[PDB]
Amino acid sequence: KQYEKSENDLKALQSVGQIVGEVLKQLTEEKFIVKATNGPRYVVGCRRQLDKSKLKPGTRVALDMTTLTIMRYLPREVDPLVYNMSHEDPGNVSYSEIGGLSEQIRELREVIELPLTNPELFQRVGIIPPKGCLLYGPPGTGKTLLARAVASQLDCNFLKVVSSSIVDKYIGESARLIREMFNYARDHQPCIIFMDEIDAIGGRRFSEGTSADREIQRTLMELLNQMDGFDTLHRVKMIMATNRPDTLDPAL
């Protein structure tokens, strides 16, 4: 049993340190143009054996480090973080502990819960369900308790995301996580995505500030286009949570 495990290790060492890439655009059947997840853009081949048809720009390929030929096909790109968000759906707090808020609770369902089962109900009206939910309130109310509490009771796929540390100073690395959650939800349809403390990403005019005021804006720009820009949601709903709607960008 031990010998079998030992065997795969040699495969890496023969290729010398295998690297991930993606097919940018297909030049011809033999030659693809690959943009690397590691760095340089590459012109690549394919094994005789490995079919051309399988590779897609929506998905990832692997390359032999030393000759740059595609060894094989790899699955769709998803961030490590997003796998942890999907899992985080049962954080407990039942529907009993969030009561008294019940009138406001009914309003949240109309937006979030109804398009999952049937988008057909809003379709008969001849209207496309309203985009984005904003939860706001004075502190202690339980704006975050509510979003979280229903997600556990149904136990639907729910991405719970902390967005008050997702911005980093690492240019380009902050962008990817924010994109990935929208894309992912379209795939795992139906889904709900809730971002908590996105007051952080809520930006202002700034432009006399530190390096910290600068990173917030890139992320804030990205959200705008993703909602309404030329890209838009469907059955899947995106929920925001704030403390102040005043900290928010005027455009947002």
């Binding site: 010998y3 030992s6 065997e7 795969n8 690297i19 991930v20 054996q49 060894m71 094989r72």
Partner: protein, 74 residues
């Protein structure tokens, strides 16, 4: 025979060596993943359990993961 193959592993186990984070754990079978067609058949996905690991040196590396390392933690 285990010891000859592991010796190469031992040198990588010894210093210098990096820390990284796991982007995805694929964990597919060493048994047939699909019979590739085209010019010459065979399988090209003869990879065992695999992981796509991101180094902290802003490059991405593909790696076949061993079976001895517990699957659950990963």
């Amino acid at each position: 025979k285990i010891k000859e193959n592991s010796e190469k592993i031992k040198v990588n186990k010894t210093l210098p060596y990096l820390v990284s984070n796991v982007i995805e754990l694929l964990d597919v079978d060493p048994n047939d993943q699909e019979e590739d067609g085209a010019n010459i058949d065979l399988d090209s996905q003869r990879k065992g359990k695999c992981a796509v690991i991101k180094t902290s040196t802003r490059q991405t590396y593909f790696l076949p993961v061993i079976g001895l390392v517990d699957a659950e933690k990963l």
